[PDB]
Design a protein around this ligand. Sequence first.
Ligand SMILES: C[C@]12CC=C(c3cc(F)c(O)cc3F)C[C@H]1CC[C@@H]2O
Ligand SMILES: C[C@]12CC=C(c3cc(F)c(O)cc3F)C[C@H]1CC[C@@H]2O
Lengths: 10, 9, 237, 240
Amino acid sequence: KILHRLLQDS
Amino acid sequence: KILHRLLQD
Amino acid sequence: SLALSLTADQMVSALLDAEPPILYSEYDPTRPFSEASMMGLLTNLADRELVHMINWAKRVPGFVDLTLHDQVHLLECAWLEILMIGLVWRSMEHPGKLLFAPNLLLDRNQGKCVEGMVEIFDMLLATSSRFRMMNLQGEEFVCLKSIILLNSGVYTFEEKDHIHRVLDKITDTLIHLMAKAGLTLQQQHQRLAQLLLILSHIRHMSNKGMEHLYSMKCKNVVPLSDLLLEMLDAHRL
Amino acid sequence: SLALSLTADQMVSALLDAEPPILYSEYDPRPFSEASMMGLLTNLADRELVHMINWAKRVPGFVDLTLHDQVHLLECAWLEILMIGLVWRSMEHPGKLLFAPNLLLDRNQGKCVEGMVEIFDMLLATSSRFRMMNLQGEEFVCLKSIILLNSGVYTFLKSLEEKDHIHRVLDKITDTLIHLMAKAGLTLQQQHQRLAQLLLILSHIRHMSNKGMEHLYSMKCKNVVPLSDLLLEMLDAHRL
Ligand SMILES: C[C@]12CC=C(c3cc(F)c(O)cc3F)C[C@H]1CC[C@@H]2O
Ligand SMILES: C[C@]12CC=C(c3cc(F)c(O)cc3F)C[C@H]1CC[C@@H]2O
């Protein structure tokens, strides 16, 4: 998910 | 409305 | 208004006395469950409960001081929330199960019988576990149910000011109960917050339940009573 | 494992500093069509979602949670958080919604989009309520953080370790709210009453989000507006 990526990338 | 009627006495 | 002159103990007594009875289901054990028959049982039960709820509402302090149009609006808005918190309350001592009626105790697997209903059951069960984990008291429960009745539809409206004064009284009552139970001052406002935040989840379950009920109606799964059709129509889905 | 050590003043400070920026709209103040307005609102919401995630990870206790649980909380609460933000910045504009400093919409402009004026009415009523209560900025950031942690916690092995942690942080924010009220000179009875008043509004905010989710889904299926991939995935999480 995009939300996954966003939460990892700060 | 049934509710309106039921809310009376 | 006489409702505002009520003490905390008087508020509790009035609310406890106005408590509706636990009704029975039309459950027939001679036949297996179908999606239609289970929806039939639940909506039949809800319909009979609604009549009791209407008369209960009239005994909630401050409610009859409102116009008929405002009474109608509040009940139209909160009826499913009220049915659900009642269900969650009487399901407290039955982990993993929902006590719709003493003769209708259902788990999540039986909820699968109806399309999309197991999701509702899970939420209801989780709420019941929450009340059980908090050790929700009967006096607290009737305060919460009355709060739902007065609050849920007040933002869709002085009539509004009278409602807020009564809501404040119930807040005072909840705090009174917690203090009387020996909770420290900090524990009091912490628990008050915990109880009221659950009402956001109850509101959520109601919205989901309203859409699911509407879905069942629009697929001719079950014939809803004229009263239920009206309560559902009030939400205009 | 550290948010529990925060004082009430430090909680406020951390929350105030974690606040997201106020974004502008592309709005060229050319008159609205139905697709035009939905475009502005959804484009704005999508850009706000990116900042919301930065904010969420600065909310005390949020990063202690698993990546899975962080996703669940944001998926559940994202529209609630957008709406309480909108309502908060619309507080000093009676009868108007301040989506952006350059996009201030009155009620009748909700009629541009089918079924949106009903959403606007609910948002405006909430804003009127905040204005009536003289809601403070410090109270606002507390309420928004409560929404983030509370809205999705009921829909969650050692999963109880996450839930108990979330509830422990929730109690801390409650303490913070009470602290602000005591500091404002409110009596004990007034503190409890105001706390209750604020939290019951979150019930209406939940209601607005559920309604908005359905409206946004309807606009999606009709394709009056092209939603971003991120927005579509946030909407999909509520599986309407
Ligand atoms: C049949 C539904 C599930 C449970 C419902 C229900 C019925 C009751 F009598 C009751 O005391 C509580 C309920 F929560 C009503 C419908 C809402 C969503 C589903 O359609
Ligand atoms: C366009 C809608 C109305 C307002 C929305 C909205 C957008 C924002 F940027 C914002 O900061 C807040 C909002 F509440 C998004 C949609 C939810 C329901 C409607 O479709």
